[PDB]
Design a protein around this ligand. Sequence first.
Ligand SMILES: *[C@@H]1O[C@H](CO)[C@@H](O[C@@H]2O[C@H](CO)[C@@H](O[C@@H]3O[C@H](CO[C@H]4O[C@H](CO)[C@@H](O)[C@H](O)[C@@H]4O)[C@@H](O)[C@H](O[C@H]4O[C@H](CO)[C@@H](O)[C@H](O)[C@@H]4O)[C@@H]3O)[C@H](O)[C@H]2NC(C)=O)[C@H](O)[C@H]1NC(C)=O
Ligand SMILES: *[C@@H]1O[C@H](CO)[C@@H](O[C@@H]2O[C@H](CO)[C@@H](O[C@@H]3O[C@H](CO)[C@@H](O)[C@H](O)[C@@H]3O)[C@H](O)[C@H]2NC(C)=O)[C@H](O)[C@H]1NC(C)=O
Ligand SMILES: *[C@@H]1O[C@H](CO)[C@@H](O[C@@H]2O[C@H](CO)[C@@H](O)[C@H](O)[C@H]2NC(C)=O)[C@H](O)[C@H]1NC(C)=O
Lengths: 433, 433, 49
Amino acid sequence: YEHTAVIPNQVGFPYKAHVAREGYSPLTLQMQVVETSLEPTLNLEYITCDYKTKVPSPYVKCCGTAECRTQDKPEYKCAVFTGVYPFMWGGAYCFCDSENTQMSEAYVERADVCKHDYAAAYRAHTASLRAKIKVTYGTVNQTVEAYVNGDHAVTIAGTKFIFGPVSTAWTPFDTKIVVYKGEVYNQDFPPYGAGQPGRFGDIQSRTLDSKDLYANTGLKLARPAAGNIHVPYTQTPSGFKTWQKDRDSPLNAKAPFGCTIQTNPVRAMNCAVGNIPVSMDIADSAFTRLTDAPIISELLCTVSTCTHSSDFGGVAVLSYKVEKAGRCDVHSHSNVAVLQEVSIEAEGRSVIHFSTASAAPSFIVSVCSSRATCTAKCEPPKDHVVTYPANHNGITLPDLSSTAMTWAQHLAGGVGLLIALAVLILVIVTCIT
Amino acid sequence: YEHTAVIPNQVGFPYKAHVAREGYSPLTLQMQVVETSLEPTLNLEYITCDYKTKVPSPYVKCCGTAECRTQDKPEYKCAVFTGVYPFMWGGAYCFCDSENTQMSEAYVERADVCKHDYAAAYRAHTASLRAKIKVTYGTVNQTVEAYVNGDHAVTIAGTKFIFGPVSTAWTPFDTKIVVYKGEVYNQDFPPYGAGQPGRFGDIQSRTLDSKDLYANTGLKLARPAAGNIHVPYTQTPSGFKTWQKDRDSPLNAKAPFGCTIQTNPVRAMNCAVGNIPVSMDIADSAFTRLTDAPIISELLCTVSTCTHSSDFGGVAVLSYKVEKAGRCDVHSHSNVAVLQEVSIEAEGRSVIHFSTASAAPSFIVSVCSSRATCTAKCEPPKDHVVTYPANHNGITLPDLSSTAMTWAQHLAGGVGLLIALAVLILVIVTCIT
Amino acid sequence: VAVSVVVLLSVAASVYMCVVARNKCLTPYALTPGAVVPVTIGVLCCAPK
Ligand SMILES: *[C@@H]1O[C@H](CO)[C@@H](O[C@@H]2O[C@H](CO)[C@@H](O[C@@H]3O[C@H](CO[C@H]4O[C@H](CO)[C@@H](O)[C@H](O)[C@@H]4O)[C@@H](O)[C@H](O[C@H]4O[C@H](CO)[C@@H](O)[C@H](O)[C@@H]4O)[C@@H]3O)[C@H](O)[C@H]2NC(C)=O)[C@H](O)[C@H]1NC(C)=O
Ligand SMILES: *[C@@H]1O[C@H](CO)[C@@H](O[C@@H]2O[C@H](CO)[C@@H](O[C@@H]3O[C@H](CO)[C@@H](O)[C@H](O)[C@@H]3O)[C@H](O)[C@H]2NC(C)=O)[C@H](O)[C@H]1NC(C)=O
Ligand SMILES: *[C@@H]1O[C@H](CO)[C@@H](O[C@@H]2O[C@H](CO)[C@@H](O)[C@H](O)[C@H]2NC(C)=O)[C@H](O)[C@H]1NC(C)=O
């Protein structure tokens, strides 16, 4: 049997879909989702960590010079200076007054200790959901898990459920994602040329194994001082260990719709983004043949009390006269409330729990191809806040039954009588002429 | 200095960039494109392979019956049969003629070669172009490798180069393609759970190791005939091999723009569409001081013969005077023609080779801060077909050139003067009012 | 509040229609000096006849 539905994507909200199928007692299905993770795809641009200035030993000579033979390393600057009188532990160094020469160099490598504490920069594209439902109907309720718009149509108990397609793929992601140890951020990372040092992404690498990191670290040498031996270098601080301070604002905080963010892989689960369309090819076996399910007649329902609560406010009891002992599914044919349960051991009395939103629960409640009207006034609650979501999601304000708009129903009145009769009296001198 | 240019995205077309940077010796530069790999981002769901109907030896007995297990396996089929009395290698097997009962069972497991060939249903998306081009400005002849999305841009020879992003985000692909040993097929696939037997996708699995797998191979087993011990079973054959012999349309014979397909990873190559933005951060060191520039007075031009060809058909010698010689440059100041080399050797007179497609070009000249015109008529070539593409990307037919347009210039039409005479004789009709 | 203002304009339109009916029923007794007006005296306050 082919039948579809449109359910909302909210964790824990129990949704009902009622099926009026021929030659069998009517059927009720219930479904609710829990882990609706939007696992996005991903891409890569580069990586970034701290650095280490690999300075070698210094080189001197006694009245003989040298030059900088090149060395294909990253940031291999070098220079050579004169006018040096280098003291040591044993005092003086050599005998050549003002002809001695100094040799030094510097070059920076991706520091080894960042192999396990790194930051990654990603571009990102469209996402795809993963719904995980309990399907809660007359056969021992099973759990299903699916990609919502792969249309990959998992099956349970002889029945083939397809899902989706999901609308607009609304994502809490920009297009320039950056990821740290257990967090994510939205930034504008520099496009593989670090036009500014002392920033984030100051040094880069295509992966953890690429053999050539790129650094615009801004490192120039200096001149050695008078007397002592050392190597003076002045370069900017590490842009990484100074970027880790000014993060201040994860996507974990400013995420809309409450999506919890996780890493390895990046994923956003339990989002209240829109809703889900579903279609069912329902197995013909799991029904019941209507000669066996009892046909209860001569019924009119009642009510007890109503509430604009959230959990389950209104309770309404029903009276019906049995003819054979059995069971039957129940349903409400409108959106103005939902029901706590699915079936009833239908022997005479029946207590059910509904949840109205605002003003007037006009009801059509069904029991095995029997309709019954129901209305009830309400008493609004007294509390302010609760610690759990709502179960009356079908928010509907208005109605018309015996209390709402009734003053308008008496207010309309008047005018037309006056004008019509007044003109049909006007004619009595203006139809003879 | 910074400048921006465009370039047509094909192979072979030499492009010239003639920056007009006053106060210096002028400069043109050449870029030529030697690859365009266009890769999309793969996202697979399942694979395929021929199965193997693996069946164990059948359980036999007389003189009593048995039952069956149905453990967790792919498509566990089994049934017992009442009255199976066989023969054997010699004589018989039981003497319980009305109680000879035989059980049989078989299931489906992926074949041995399923570790070696498949068809991945790739849901690929969001292609991203690449390039391997070479640039030559003054003392440079070196090549470069560039991504063309707006991000990656580094350097060559101490100058900064940036390529892209693209003009029109077009792919020569679809959304839901399939791969094979070396090919690509732009077709649909079953939805991973609608594997109707015999067609494509009769068995599938998320990867090579998803230890549970879908199958709808219509397998059913019947009862054997008397005497011989065996087991019969019927199902449609392994539809993968049927799909092998009716492929009938690869992408390497149908893809547009001649952009050929390769795999591992799945990419396209040499796409002849669109243009590329490009921005240059060019350093000073390539330039030359206008003090040391070749000074050239009284520049003229002329032509010898034109060939309206594909190759560099036009030869135009160039008359120019001299007062001090050096290394000069040359460039065309329209889109109509193109020039062969980027420089001359300044000695008295030069020869250049220019190329066009319109038989009456007026590319003016540009030579070392001296611009002067020369126009030429042309003549179609004796040949019909060639074995190299065009080198004249400015295929712009209508030039004015005062050669065929001069007749339209001789469509002047002083009959407007005649109309003016008509209005004036109307006026002198009116002057006797 | 818009319901309030549309009720006000509608009742004003009704009174306008009613008084215009009264005027178009009464005005043709303006001339003909002897103004002998019948038991329709429920309107048309008595002028010097
Ligand atoms: C505390 O614990 C965490 C969790 O284990 C550690 O984090 C990981 O460190 C390991 C060891 O390096 C990482 O494993 C390596 O990942 C490399 C690349 O990342 C990709 O692959 C992983 C799965 O492996 C994906 O999850 C991820 O998204 C990427 O797709 C792999 O390339 C490495 O594989 C190796 O073998 C191949 C083949 O021989 C080699 O070519 C590789 O070079 C490499 O040797 C390996 O899988 C793991 O990714 C890390 N997890 C993260 C960062 O989340 C921490 O390191 C640990 N703490 C400390 C201090 O070490
Ligand atoms: C099928 O539907 C029934 C509803 O009739 C589901 O039942 C309820 O199931 C949960 C667990 O799934 C029960 O939970 C926990 O039980 C422990 C004791 O084992 C208790 O200490 C916890 O506080 C909690 O109650 C729960 O009791 C049970 N009943 C009610 C009234 O909530 C059932 O889970 C569905 N699925 C299956 C496979 O049966
Ligand atoms: C740029 O310089 C290179 C060599 O420095 C020139 O050469 C190519 O040389 C390699 C040598 O292995 C050959 O394999 C190629 O076939 C050569 N290519 C060509 C087109 O000749 C190259 O020609 C120079 N570029 C110019 C002159 O434009």
